[PDB]
Design a protein around this ligand. Structure first.
Ligand code: ATP
Ligand code: ATP
Ligand code: ZN
Ligand code: ZN
Lengths: 394, 393
């Protein structure tokens, strides 16, 4: 009874505890996961409303209809959101080209983008969310990166107050310090200085809690970030996550843990290959952020297999090894899947994934979130309200 | 009830749950604290038997009795274990000199030091212990520091194997860079190469799990530590622990976390006066090792107060701030107190400390231990068996 992730599970009757240990059903437990309080740690602001009906809602409320770009032709791959074959990362970023840099530069569009995304987290029962944005991408000749960040913060801080404290999601912001291919270390300096300033401007409500080192790949300009000077970042309270995408080495991961002092790892799908790194990543507490849909589409994994094969999703292996694994959505729009579909696609990606392990990935995320003491106790008190099962008759 | 540390406490009757939240009593709770499955993270091998009956049980086992040095007369202060005035740190170390490097160069005395200490951990109901030692301090012209360490390891492993699994204390070894370091980078290089080699020799039973950078408290050896590459230590899997304490050098602790990648801080008593550093130490999980008796005897703290002041023992503040705080013995011999007596003294150091806060320091210690997945899965299964209270009210 001392292996349950939350203390409230121990106070259940044996009928339900026996139910927690059976495999998750991706066709019947759709309603139990939905009511579950989730925790999002990898969500990109500029990828929420990329195509469909939400893209029109964002483009409709623009403050400069004349400035809005035309909606270019972005055809989704067939079988979407489960493509016939993977599409890659470069070809995956382009599906969200109807929204982002060239759309959200409109102050009006940014309001709907930040307010429609909060309504998508609330609908999903998210209790905590770290949103990732690049304010320097949405700036113009009259709106500096600090002005855009001011707006983004208060757009989420406004939605957070118009919501009852019982169902209120808590949104925090991560500044994606992108390793620009075309931009130089000037871009990094501005990004790291913007987070250090924001990391002390706000102490309550929406806060800038860390920096996301996207572009950690490209081990040719190695690294323009391992020069670092990240010590100011560490002394102001900020936390570092490395967006280890599009790469299959282990040396970068080693240097992110011990030179960058990173606390989370993004899309670290090849950790089991090196068991020495896997043991360190599990004893130091480093958290691994996995995105089921975004990974099945960029990389592609076997679906509905009946055995843990060689090329299977590493979620179950990570859990066995002790790694603190979390499940996220990456791009809500670009992947067309909410935080519930991703936790339900796990049943088909990892054969045998128990529905108790789902609660473990949520308890892990609750410990890997860059929240403060007040924010944690409010998050812990909301995951303690785990809903009771739906179908236990067999 | 989400605040309960141990999932097993959720299954207690509502009558007892209120008992936990009541303040601890350093007298009537002895039987309950004495039976708690405890975790030891700061215990020195060379400070176990410095005086008394134990000091002679060790000397009476040396293979070369004639080689034993004469038993000096070390006068313990009056009041001891609880002095009416602190004796400083340098006096504290000299207080134990009938044991340690001078005595434990004999294979017979060393064998009786690693087995009498294991009997003190069992008598105290310890389920996990990390013991720190300096093999190079006990080496002779014919006994290499690796020969000493290989003997120390097998004395504990042979003691652990002879005890039933359900009552067995798991002992792990930390290699300590002695406080007299920095002089030569040759000795800190032989020290880190011994741990990298030991961290691969043994993968089961008693293991070398980390290195303890003592002397960090000094400035001429803290730069030698910052000039030495610790990267090979991190790749092997060894963890790093640093001694804080008398030196209230905030800059030292900052660099020990982000340069040496330290996971634990020893005697970090001045963290509250640095609110910025107390947030990083409380959000990253860095654990703080506190020694209630070794801290009352080296620094001195108010006892039996009624309400918090401005200089009381910071264990209450640390816990509120979210810091992961552990309680240990430091030197079990030099201080006449076991792990049970250090937990009970917190009731006098910290006014109003709750019986649930005591059980938290043992869950914090369990998460701070440098044990692996197998060791951890067996330590949780022993902390979950928390004894039920005696009176209940
Ligand atoms: N999968 C990924 N791999 C690498 N970098 C990524 C990835 N996803 C996002 N990024 C980085 O995040 C930065 C911010 O992207 P975001 O999704 O917030 O929208 P955006 O800046 O409006 O988009 P874009 O530049 O594609 O039009 C991008 O510039 C890119 O550097
Ligand atoms: N409070 C402390 N602060 C700093 N260093 C300490 C403290 N207590 C012990 N040490 C260091 O711990 C190291 C190991 O001490 P231990 O108790 O194991 O005895 P020892 O070194 O074998 O004994 P001896 O000093 O008789 O040779 C010593 O080198 C000492 O420098
Ligand atoms: Zn991403
Ligand atoms: Zn010590």
């Amino acid at each position: 009874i001392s292996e349950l992730p939350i203390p409230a599970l121990a106070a259940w009757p044996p009928s339900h505890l026996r139910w927690l240990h059976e495999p998750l059903d991706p066709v019947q437990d759709k309603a139990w996961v939905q009511a579950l309080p989730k925790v999002e740690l990898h969500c990109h602001l500029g990828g929420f409303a990329t195509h469909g009906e939400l893209l029109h809602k964002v483009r409709q409320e623009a403050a400069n209809p004349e400035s809005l770009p035309p909606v270019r032709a972005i055809p989704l791959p067939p079988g979407w959101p489960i493509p016939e074959e993977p599409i890659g990362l470069e070809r995956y970023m382009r599906l969200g080209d109807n929204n982002g840099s060239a759309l959200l530069k409109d102050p009006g569009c940014l309001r709907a983008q930040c307010r429609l995304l909060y309504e998508a987290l609330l609908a999903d029962h998210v209790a905590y969310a770290e949103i990732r944005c690049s304010p320097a991408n949405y700036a113009s000749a009259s709106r500096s990166p600090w002005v855009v960040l001011q707006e983004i913060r208060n757009h989420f801080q406004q939605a957070m107050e118009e919501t009852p404290e019982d169902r209120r999601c808590h949104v925090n912001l991560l500044l994606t310090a992108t390793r620009e291919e075309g931009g130089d270390r000037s871009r990094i300096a501005r990004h790291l200085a913007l987070a250090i300033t924001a990391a002390e401007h706000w102490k309550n409500g929406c806060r800038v809690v860390g920096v996301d080192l996207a572009g950690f790949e490209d081990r040719t300009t190695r690294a323009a970030m391992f020069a670092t000077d990240f010590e100011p970042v560490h002394r102001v309270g900020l936390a570092v996550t490395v967006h280890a995408g599009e790469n299959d080495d282990v040396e970068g991961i080693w240097q992110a843990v011990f030179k960058l002092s990173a606390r989370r790892l993004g899309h670290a799908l090849h950790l089991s290959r090196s068991p020495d790194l896997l043991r360190v990543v599990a004893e130091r507490g480093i958290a691994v952020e996995l995105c089921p849909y975004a990974n099945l589409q960029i990389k592609g994994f076997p679906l509905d297999e009946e055995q843990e094969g060689s090329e299977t999703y590493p979620l179950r292996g990570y859990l066995a090894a002790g790694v603190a694994v979390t499940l996220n959505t990456d791009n809500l729009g670009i992947s067309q899947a909410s935080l519930t579909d991703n936790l339900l696609l796990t049943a088909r990606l990892c054969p045998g994934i128990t529905r108790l392990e789902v609660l473990k990935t949520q308890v892990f995320a609750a410990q890997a979130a860059f929240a403060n003491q007040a924010e944690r106790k409010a998050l812990w008190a909301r995951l303690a309200q785990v809903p009771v099962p739906t179908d236990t008759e067999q």
